[PDB]
Each structure stands twice: as C-alpha cells, then as structure tokens.
Design a protein around this motif. Structure first.
Motif: not given
Length: 110
Positions: A34-40, A64-72, A76-84
C-alpha cells in the motif's frame, strides 16, 4: 513478485462498463504494498463508478499518503480532484456515464 501486472490487466476492465470487476483488480495493490498511491488512483476511480463514492474517499485519503514525491506529481492531485467531487456525488448525480431511460408509454409509436 509483481504489482503492475494484475493492476494494468484491469485498466481495460474499468473502461469496459463492468466496474465491479475493476474494483477487484486494484485492491491487491493496497494489500501487496500500500506504500504506492497508484493502488488508490484506479480503485479511487472505479468505486465511484458503481456508486460507492463513500468508499472512494476512504481510498483517496489513503493514496495521498504516498504522493510525497515527483513519482506521483499528478496522482498527488487526482485523488484530491476526486475527493473534491465525491463530497458532491455521494448523494447526487451530475456526471453519469451508464444511465438509461425508456418511452412514456405514449410516444409517437415511431
């Protein structure tokens, strides 16, 4: 050991219109590592697609706990976009994609 294989093999299922399978194709990432945001970033888009927006937000705040870096940088904003938008679709509908209707039992017979 793999991760992207089971997930990508359902990116199409999510777009075929049988989303119930597509949820069941991104859940194994949240259990494999679960250390990867792509699963979410794909389950967080297929849960909403059945109507389970209530469960989708509970995944957006866990990716959004796993988007702490440029790899995502975008996730980092798509999970926020859908939460929004889940907070406005968990009890409403203005973005349907599979809705259906019929005649008023009195149409012009044509």
């Amino acid at each position: 050991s793999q991760f992207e294989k089971q997930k990508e093999q359902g990116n199409s299922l999510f777009k075929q219109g049988l989303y119930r399978e597509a949820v069941h194709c991104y859940d194994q990432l949240i259990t494999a590592q679960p250390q990867n945001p792509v699963g979410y970033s794909n389950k967080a888009m297929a849960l909403i697609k059945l109507g389970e927006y209530t469960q989708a937000i509970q995944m957006c705040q866990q990716g959004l706990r796993y988007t702490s870096t440029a790899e995502h940088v975008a996730i980092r904003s798509k999970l926020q976009y859908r939460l929004e938008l889940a907070q406005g679709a968990v009890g409403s509908v203005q973005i349907p994609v599979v809705e259906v209707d019929e005649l008023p039992e009195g149409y012009d017979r044509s």
